[PDB]
PDB file of C-alpha atoms and ligand atoms in Angstrom:
ATOM      1  CA  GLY A   1      59.636  84.935 123.923  1.00 28.62           C
ATOM      2  CA  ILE A   2      61.017  86.964 121.061  1.00 29.50           C
ATOM      3  CA  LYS A   3      64.635  85.913 120.671  1.00 25.16           C
ATOM      4  CA  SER A   4      65.867  87.705 117.514  1.00 26.32           C
ATOM      5  CA  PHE A   5      65.087  90.309 114.866  1.00 29.50           C
ATOM      6  CA  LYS A   6      65.821  90.797 111.196  1.00 33.41           C
ATOM      7  CA  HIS A   7      64.142  94.241 111.110  1.00 31.29           C
ATOM      8  CA  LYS A   8      65.989  96.923 113.073  1.00 31.92           C
ATOM      9  CA  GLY A   9      62.892  99.135 113.378  1.00 31.86           C
ATOM     10  CA  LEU A  10      60.977  96.401 115.189  1.00 29.52           C
ATOM     11  CA  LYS A  11      64.059  95.594 117.258  1.00 29.67           C
ATOM     12  CA  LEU A  12      64.479  99.199 118.410  1.00 31.65           C
ATOM     13  CA  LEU A  13      60.778  99.486 119.207  1.00 29.84           C
ATOM     14  CA  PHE A  14      60.630  96.258 121.185  1.00 31.57           C
ATOM     15  CA  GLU A  15      63.990  96.498 122.975  1.00 33.29           C
ATOM     16  CA  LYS A  16      64.375 100.252 123.530  1.00 30.64           C
ATOM     17  CA  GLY A  17      61.001 101.935 122.953  1.00 30.78           C
ATOM     18  CA  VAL A  18      62.431 103.809 119.963  1.00 28.04           C
ATOM     19  CA  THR A  19      59.747 104.531 117.401  1.00 29.08           C
ATOM     20  CA  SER A  20      61.846 105.907 114.520  1.00 30.95           C
ATOM     21  CA  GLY A  21      61.721 102.734 112.446  1.00 31.57           C
ATOM     22  CA  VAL A  22      57.946 102.318 112.147  1.00 27.50           C
ATOM     23  CA  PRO A  23      55.031 104.562 111.176  1.00 27.36           C
ATOM     24  CA  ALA A  24      54.105 106.778 114.122  1.00 27.50           C
ATOM     25  CA  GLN A  25      50.403 106.041 113.784  1.00 26.67           C
ATOM     26  CA  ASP A  26      51.025 102.334 114.128  1.00 24.00           C
ATOM     27  CA  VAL A  27      53.177 102.208 117.220  1.00 26.36           C
ATOM     28  CA  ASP A  28      50.438 100.964 119.560  1.00 30.06           C
ATOM     29  CA  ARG A  29      49.202  98.202 117.241  1.00 31.07           C
ATOM     30  CA  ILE A  30      52.740  97.088 116.394  1.00 29.87           C
ATOM     31  CA  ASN A  31      53.469  96.867 120.133  1.00 30.04           C
ATOM     32  CA  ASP A  32      50.248  94.846 120.577  1.00 30.16           C
ATOM     33  CA  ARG A  33      51.395  92.290 117.973  1.00 27.15           C
ATOM     34  CA  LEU A  34      54.978  92.166 119.292  1.00 26.32           C
ATOM     35  CA  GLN A  35      53.699  91.609 122.820  1.00 25.70           C
ATOM     36  CA  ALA A  36      51.370  88.820 121.591  1.00 24.78           C
ATOM     37  CA  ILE A  37      54.267  87.069 119.838  1.00 23.93           C
ATOM     38  CA  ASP A  38      56.515  87.502 122.876  1.00 26.39           C
ATOM     39  CA  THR A  39      54.032  86.026 125.289  1.00 27.03           C
ATOM     40  CA  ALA A  40      52.733  83.145 123.127  1.00 30.00           C
ATOM     41  CA  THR A  41      53.953  79.660 124.011  1.00 30.43           C
ATOM     42  CA  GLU A  42      52.060  77.965 121.160  1.00 32.15           C
ATOM     43  CA  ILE A  43      51.373  79.241 117.688  1.00 32.05           C
ATOM     44  CA  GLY A  44      47.617  78.752 117.993  1.00 30.50           C
ATOM     45  CA  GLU A  45      47.513  81.507 120.617  1.00 30.40           C
ATOM     46  CA  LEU A  46      48.147  83.883 117.678  1.00 29.97           C
ATOM     47  CA  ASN A  47      45.219  82.490 115.628  1.00 32.59           C
ATOM     48  CA  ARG A  48      43.057  85.447 116.518  1.00 30.45           C
ATOM     49  CA  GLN A  49      40.645  86.820 113.961  1.00 29.61           C
ATOM     50  CA  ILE A  50      42.239  90.244 113.615  1.00 28.27           C
ATOM     51  CA  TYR A  51      45.788  88.811 113.403  1.00 29.64           C
ATOM     52  CA  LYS A  52      45.221  86.802 110.181  1.00 30.53           C
ATOM     53  CA  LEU A  53      47.809  84.202 111.224  1.00 29.96           C
ATOM     54  CA  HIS A  54      49.215  82.446 108.133  1.00 33.18           C
ATOM     55  CA  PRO A  55      52.048  79.915 107.674  1.00 35.20           C
ATOM     56  CA  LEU A  56      54.267  80.856 104.764  1.00 36.80           C
ATOM     57  CA  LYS A  57      55.520  78.432 102.090  1.00 40.23           C
ATOM     58  CA  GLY A  58      58.171  77.780  99.508  1.00 40.45           C
ATOM     59  CA  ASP A  59      61.150  79.995 100.145  1.00 38.28           C
ATOM     60  CA  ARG A  60      59.464  81.101 103.386  1.00 37.73           C
ATOM     61  CA  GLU A  61      58.639  77.643 104.682  1.00 39.67           C
ATOM     62  CA  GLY A  62      59.024  77.700 108.467  1.00 41.40           C
ATOM     63  CA  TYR A  63      57.802  81.300 108.793  1.00 45.68           C
ATOM     64  CA  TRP A  64      54.502  82.720 109.970  1.00 46.18           C
ATOM     65  CA  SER A  65      52.757  86.034 109.341  1.00 46.69           C
ATOM     66  CA  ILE A  66      50.439  88.115 111.528  1.00 45.33           C
ATOM     67  CA  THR A  67      48.821  91.363 110.448  1.00 47.30           C
ATOM     68  CA  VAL A  68      49.170  94.741 112.110  1.00 46.66           C
ATOM     69  CA  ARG A  69      46.947  96.716 109.714  1.00 45.97           C
ATOM     70  CA  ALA A  70      46.165  96.628 105.954  1.00 44.83           C
ATOM     71  CA  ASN A  71      49.133  94.822 104.410  1.00 43.36           C
ATOM     72  CA  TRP A  72      51.541  95.662 107.290  1.00 42.66           C
ATOM     73  CA  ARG A  73      52.662  92.204 108.654  1.00 41.72           C
ATOM     74  CA  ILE A  74      55.162  90.823 111.177  1.00 40.91           C
ATOM     75  CA  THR A  75      56.824  87.587 110.056  1.00 42.93           C
ATOM     76  CA  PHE A  76      58.779  85.161 112.213  1.00 43.93           C
ATOM     77  CA  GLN A  77      59.801  81.560 112.888  1.00 46.08           C
ATOM     78  CA  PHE A  78      58.110  79.966 115.931  1.00 45.95           C
ATOM     79  CA  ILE A  79      60.041  77.070 117.461  1.00 44.69           C
ATOM     80  CA  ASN A  80      59.612  75.426 120.869  1.00 43.77           C
ATOM     81  CA  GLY A  81      57.598  78.341 122.224  1.00 43.90           C
ATOM     82  CA  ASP A  82      59.944  81.137 121.081  1.00 43.16           C
ATOM     83  CA  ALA A  83      59.913  83.478 118.081  1.00 45.35           C
ATOM     84  CA  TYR A  84      62.891  84.197 115.830  1.00 45.88           C
ATOM     85  CA  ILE A  85      63.951  86.382 112.905  1.00 48.13           C
ATOM     86  CA  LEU A  86      61.164  88.928 113.324  1.00 51.04           C
ATOM     87  CA  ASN A  87      60.625  91.079 110.212  1.00 48.34           C
ATOM     88  CA  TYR A  88      58.156  93.848 109.184  1.00 48.02           C
ATOM     89  CA  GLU A  89      56.696  94.208 105.659  1.00 46.87           C
ATOM     90  CA  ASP A  90      53.987  96.164 103.817  1.00 50.29           C
ATOM     91  CA  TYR A  91      52.381  94.199 100.992  1.00 49.42           C
ATOM     92  CA  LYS A  92      49.664  91.602 100.372  1.00 51.56           C
ATOM     93  CA  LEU A  93      50.767  87.842 100.050  1.00 51.55           C
ATOM     94  CA  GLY A  94      50.327  86.205  96.600  1.00 48.86           C
ATOM     95  CA  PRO A  95      48.645  82.966  95.434  1.00 50.06           C
ATOM     96  CA  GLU A  96      51.627  80.621  95.904  1.00 49.58           C
ATOM     97  CA  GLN A  97      51.547  81.298  99.655  1.00 50.18           C
TER      98      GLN A  97
HETATM   99 CL1  LIG B 101      68.510  90.267 117.267  1.00 49.44          CL
HETATM  100 CL1  LIG B 102      53.475  75.580 118.689  1.00 53.44          CL
END
């Protein structure tokens, strides 16, 4: 399950159905990714072609990324079947990752 958020927009969407903090057009796909993270018990369940699952490195060691659309990505820690510190970002990852 999802246990914590860094990004208030994702938190409000997931917990309350409030859509103010994300692009309107993306609400359904963001909910799809959140629901996938929430129901996964192992990280490989998120290794779906359209999700572009990627473990992050360096200062982001311990985090994972999945893609909503374009460069829109949800990042999180995944530990003992639960997801933590969920964040939302809009940029492509660089070569050191
Ligand atoms: Cl939280
Ligand atoms: Cl796992």
